[PDB]
Design brief:
The structure is a homodimer of 670-residue chains.
Chain A lengths: L13 H6 L22 H9 L16 H26 L4 H17 L12 H14 L18 H25 L12 H24 L11 H11 L6 H23 L10 H16 L1 H5 L22 H25 L11 H16 L10 H9 L5 H15 L10 H16 L5 H7 L2 H14 L4 H20 L6 E3 L6 E3 L12 E4 L11 H11 L3 H15 L22 E5 L8 H17 L2 E5 L4 H7 L17 H15 L2
Parallel strand pairs in A: 3-4, 4-5
Antiparallel strand pairs in A: 1-2
Helix pairs in contact in A: 3-4, 3-5, 3-14, 3-15, 3-16, 4-13, 4-15, 6-12, 6-13, 7-8, 7-16, 7-18, 9-16, 18-19
């Protein structure tokens, strides 16, 4: 009445096809399509190095009057937020702290300068140290006693040294293989991640690390389990030794943790420009050590010591590798887990603002930095989330924060060792607990997922359980596999609607949706909100017949019953208008859309041909409207268009198909 | 001019929404939605047993005058086509022939009577015996010598007995677990198969079995390899021992195989009602044994013997099972491979004619029959393709053919043992070779696949290589995994077209397709032939901007350049009509369809919201036409419709979106 005036003559598909003429646009030199490129232009090398290292060009774009102060306080904050954290990681992997310091210093350096993300923090995940601890336990148990001359229970040195050697070697190989699979531009490829996966993974990891660090909170090193229910056995040991252990140390650790929680409460009471997350952990540790020295704790009550730092010189080196023909199992397991860490970190540093970075070269730089750091006495470093938020909030121009963190790393490691020699383990315990309660608290998201959907919550809980109760690597691989297969499941269970012609209109919408809709008699309309593949063809045909009610098999069954009762594209009706037919319907033509369908396969083509030919054999038309050019080619390239009329029975528009069908029906009236 | 008269006032989405009213159709008793069912109707139990065993009802539907003769000659043929085949399988698994006979008799019986496929043959695949041989080698090598009292190299008895015990136990457990995973109605589930997978699998299996049976053609049992390149090592041994071996036996075997091939040629010269595939293998073996007895072959030249059958009584039994806490590896491997065999056989006996059978109960019956046969001294039986074609060609009423095959199995096993005692191995060699050359010959399909597509041929060759050169179970699992992930790849790389308004029409087709097409200025049209998921969002946005040319990031870049040069749903243009703007385009609105899109995800919703909001911030309209009800709900159920105008900016029709956009543009003219 207002618009939508079409009034167009019938143009199904092939009238359009004949209406227009083809293009060619054929490019030459199919082989040397790019050999003509690859010039010696200085701009070419210029962009090559900038996409490799544009530190040459972040120089002038840095003002000072505010950027300097912002980046420096950011560096102070990130250093204080990595040092106890990095040391806790080195302890969770059961490594002498010197290697934690090497890691926190040098790999951070060459990767921060070899890093394209503008705001990006640096700091390993504890899950790293988890890999080390678990695989070391699986390979080096805690009862390894090869006589060396100690003549007592003094194997804590050689065993730790060999474990650390294995760890550095495998971190080397993992950085290397990371490079190896990143060079193929797979930064463009590795995207196969979802937020429920990462969320459930992180939560399960949090529970695991909580359970683990409980032990170092206690002080009684019972045993370190690995594998199926490893955390469960750890808890069992905790419960068995919950009694008659170092109890005063436990009590003081928990009370000081509660006190720092209360301080955090007071800080969170008002958080503004002036309120900042102070390094109160320094106050806690210094007060604890002052009381211990004033009240004889380690020397009398034998309270815990984390590390030991003398005053001297520690030159670096470069050790060798291990027997890969046997350590390949751990090599590959840690390779894929390192991949997972890298891609997770990339995704969480991914597009957040207008600034854009790359993925493949990010990977390359990260893997090379891992390998080199391992050459220089280091495990695999990472980034984090809290430090990242800190740096982005204050200043992330290139890497000033990480530079500052590294320089304070050097400050502590180089000269100051006697004050920074001892440490209670409960210190790092409470530190990581406070660092992680934020991601811990994800209870109010549960009904949010529930009301959100079912498949997504399924994936989230599945990755959670398979990463927590199940092991580590097999668990995460199975989580990924399920994440993949649920896509197929979603494509396998679509939602069907039987369209009905809109009242006094031309649009076709589902009949049983709003109840104020008509439908054209003699015609059945089907729709799919799903593409077609091999795994979804036959259940398709079945469900289609069922929800359409019509069944050509059952049509023939009714025909058989009628025949007992009185006892080439299309076909006709053998019935001579008697009472034997069930007067249920009068349908003459069949309607199906594909405007939603993506593609088919050989199975899809075959089943389509079978169903359409048998329906024509029934004597009922089938009009498969909704093809334009692409699916048209997809079908035609299949070996089934023998140029039938079917080759013409293509409808670019459902409405056009409707109109043509009813027009030819009126034509049949003679 | 003829039809397609619409002339309808503007109805985007929500005018339609308000136009109609909802339905309820709420069913009661969400818990006991079926407890009201489950009656004691005799018809209910009647259909239950018929869907379990309708042999009660194939009785009257069987005439005799022609059906009897057809089914009897079919049974004769299937028995002669299983007996040498079944015995060859028992030998390939390295089993005493008695168990091959038990298998060919009794499991065939209870499964043929417990089988819903009307025309269905019975006969194990050789791949079965391949599983047995390979896993036995991996577990029981050929050098197992535990002293029992033989005081010589006479371990061929105890070792074979233990291997056969392991084989029967694992066939038992596999039938059991088959039952276990079939009871969950997973016959409705296991469809995840494609013809390229099965084709490449079958071809690789054919090559493997060819290489294997070459050894028994030679006679010199060098060694039986297992695993990576196991066939390769087998070939290496063949080449090393190609010399100075039993050469006269080899020569006579090959010449008689050539002679039977020539007989097959003469038979294939004319094949009609009278020409039938005669059991000429009987002639070959009887002439060979007559010459051997007349010319002293086994007794002087030591020609090969396959079996040994005395004259006596062999009562059956029921042995026990194995230590699963250790044999679980083989248990599971053979469980999944048995699954694969079952589902392949079901698919090849699947819908071929109007008759319909079930899948889950088929599985259940098959697994139970496997378990019971193993309880009665038997491996896992199967069906085949040549015997199936024979039975369907002549007669398959229920199972008369398999019954006949079993009764001749009993005939030979029970009384006739002295004549049917010895056998040359080359007999079964040539038998299986002739049985299998048909599927061997698949060379002319190669360019057929090539011209067909690339992904499908990729899958076919991949399953071929991973099943032939690679091992068996890991190879097939990886083949399935790739088959799955290539679906994601196809969904990841769709084909984009920039639609252009049809000349003097209302339809919108790609601009650079036919070159006789116009396009509306000030408007950009995008289309996707793909649904939306997490793994395909950002590469989407990138490719869309690129192939549209437009880039809001680069739009802002041009804005920055212009600003240097002169140095809330939608937005406006800050430009004051100066020369700084690049006069490349004049686009004001953005067009995208979703009539093809299936679904999105949280990632998809988020990226859509981001892109549309930033485009509005640019000052350029975006109209995402093509939503009806379903995707409408999919979006609305997401937590992003804060009831913006966007909640109304939904277009059920692309043409309607076009018309509304141009109308409001003319409205802007004031």
């Amino acid at each position: 009445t207002q618009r939508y005036y079409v009034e167009r003559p019938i143009f199904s598909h092939p009238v359009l096809q004949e209406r227009l003429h083809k293009k060619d646009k054929i490019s030459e030199s199919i082989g040397d399509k790019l050999k003509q490129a690859f010039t010696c232009t200085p701009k070419k090398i210029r962009n090559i190095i900038y996409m490799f290292l544009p530190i040459t060009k972040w120089l002038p774009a840095y003002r000072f009057k505010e950027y300097v102060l912002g980046d420096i306080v950011s560096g102070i904050s990130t250093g204080v937020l990595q040092l106890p954290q990095g040391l806790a990681f080195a302890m969770l992997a059961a490594v002498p702290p010197v290697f934690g310091l090497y890691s926190s210093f040098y790999p951070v350096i060459m990767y921060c300068f070899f890093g394209t993300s503008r705001h990006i923090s640096i700091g390993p995940f504890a899950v790293i140290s988890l890999m080390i601890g678990g695989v070391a336990v699986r390979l080096v148990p805690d009862d390894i006693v090869i006589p060396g001359g100690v003549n007592a229970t003094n194997s804590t040195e050689a065993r730790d040294a060999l474990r650390v050697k294995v760890a550095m070697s495998v971190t080397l190989l993992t950085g290397i293989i990371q490079f190896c699979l990143g060079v193929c531009r797979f930064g463009f490829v590795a995207i196969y991640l979802t937020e429920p996966l990462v969320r459930g993974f992180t939560t399960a990891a949090a529970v695991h690390v909580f359970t683990s660090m409980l032990k170092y909170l206690f002080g009684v090193k019972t045993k370190r389990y690995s594998g199926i229910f490893s955390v469960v056995y750890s808890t069992v040991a905790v419960l068995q030794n919950v009694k008659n252990l170092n109890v005063c140390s436990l009590g003081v650790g928990l009370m000081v943790f509660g006190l720092l929680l209360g301080g955090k409460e007071f800080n969170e009471r008002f958080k503004e420009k002036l309120p900042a997350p102070i390094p109160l952990e320094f106050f806690a540790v210094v007060m604890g050590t002052g009381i211990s020295a004033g009240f004889s704790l380690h020397e009398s009550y034998n309270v815990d010591v984390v590390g030991t730092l003398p005053l001297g010189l520690l030159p670096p080196a470069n050790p060798d590798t291990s027997l890969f023909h046997l350590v390949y199992v751990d090599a590959i397991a840690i390779a894929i887990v390192g991949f997972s860490v890298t891609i997770s970190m990339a995704k969480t540093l991914a597009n957040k603002h207008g600034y854009q970075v790359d993925g493949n070269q990010e990977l390359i730089a990260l893997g090379l930095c891992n390998s080199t750091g391992s050459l220089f006495q280091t495990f695999a470093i990472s980034c984090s989330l809290s430090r990242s938020l800190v740096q982005e909030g204050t200043g992330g121009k290139t890497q000033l924060a990480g530079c500052l963190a590294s320089l304070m790393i050097l400050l502590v490691i180089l000269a100051t060792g006697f004050l920074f020699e001892s440490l209670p383990q409960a210190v790092l315990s409470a530190i990581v607990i406070v660092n992680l309660k934020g991601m811990f608290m994800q209870f109010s998201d549960l009904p949010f997922f529930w009301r959100t959907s079912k498949i997504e919550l399924t994936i989230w809980l599945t990755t959670f359980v398979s990463s927590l109760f199940l092991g580590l690597d097999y668990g995460l691989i199975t989580a990924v596999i399920i994440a993949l297969m649920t896509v197929i499941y979603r494509t396998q269970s679509p939602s069907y609607i039987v369209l009905g012609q809109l009242p006094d209109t031309d649009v076709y919408i589902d009949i049983d949706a709003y109840e104020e809709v008509k439908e054209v008699p003699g015609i059945k309309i089907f729709q799919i909100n799903a593409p077609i593949y091999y795994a979804n063809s036959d259940l398709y045909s079945s469900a289609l017949k069922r929800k359409t009610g019509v069944n050509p098999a059952f049509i023939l069954g009714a025909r058989r019953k009628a025949m007992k009762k009185y006892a080439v594209t299309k076909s006709t009706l053998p019935e001579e208008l008697q009472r034997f037919m069930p007067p249920g319907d009068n349908v003459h033509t069949i309607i199906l859309d594909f405007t939603q369908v993506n593609f088919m396969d050989s199975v899809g083509v075959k089943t389509l041909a079978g169903i359409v030919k048998e329906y024509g054999d029934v004597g009922i038309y089938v009009y498969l409207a909704g093809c334009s050019a692409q699916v048209v080619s997809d079908l035609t390239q299949n070996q089934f268009f023998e140029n039938p009329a079917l080759l013409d029975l293509l409808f670019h528009s459902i409405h056009d198909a409707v109109l043509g069908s009813q027009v030819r029906e009126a034509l049949a009236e003679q």
